[PDB]
């Protein structure tokens, strides 16, 4: 588990398997972005079912994911975003959050994460999706031509 900024952490399956460091970081909100879901405090969770594949549509879930993290942080809760390896799915979500909150281009946000964890390497599909996210104004605009074209491409063989 690695701290991105105060109250905001990301990691892999390890991070959730050892709920002591979790307790010590005071984490009470957990966003799982993975193929499956993983104390004495109320706990909030969001599960975003997703495989670590370029064909996986994370883009459509980004506003929900970012809203979950944002609301938790706005409420003073520490947040963990985790995948299986802590390298791609969770990395994409964190990047999207940094992008939207700071209004930061994809390359700048991702650069920040890679400094923190050089082993961070989201799949190439997720990179493209975050570029679309920026191009849409850091939003999932379902009425945009960008989103419609992206979804048409997603359903092709």
PDB file of C-alpha atoms in Angstrom, residues 31-35 46-50 58 61 64-65 93:
ATOM      1  CA  UNK A  31     -12.603   0.989  -3.889  1.00  0.00           C
ATOM      2  CA  UNK A  32     -11.961  -2.443  -5.344  1.00  0.00           C
ATOM      3  CA  UNK A  33     -11.313  -2.513  -9.090  1.00  0.00           C
ATOM      4  CA  UNK A  34     -10.752  -6.177  -9.829  1.00  0.00           C
ATOM      5  CA  UNK A  35     -12.464  -9.345 -11.060  1.00  0.00           C
ATOM      6  CA  UNK A  46     -17.323   0.529  -4.148  1.00  0.00           C
ATOM      7  CA  UNK A  47     -16.695  -2.500  -6.322  1.00  0.00           C
ATOM      8  CA  UNK A  48     -15.862  -1.858  -9.996  1.00  0.00           C
ATOM      9  CA  UNK A  49     -15.741  -5.241 -11.766  1.00  0.00           C
ATOM     10  CA  UNK A  50     -13.015  -5.170 -14.374  1.00  0.00           C
ATOM     11  CA  UNK A  58     -12.968   1.368 -17.409  1.00  0.00           C
ATOM     12  CA  UNK A  61     -17.010   3.826 -14.703  1.00  0.00           C
ATOM     13  CA  UNK A  64     -18.552   6.887 -10.413  1.00  0.00           C
ATOM     14  CA  UNK A  65     -15.145   5.803  -9.153  1.00  0.00           C
ATOM     15  CA  UNK A  93      -8.439   4.892 -11.254  1.00  0.00           C
TER      16      UNK A  93
END
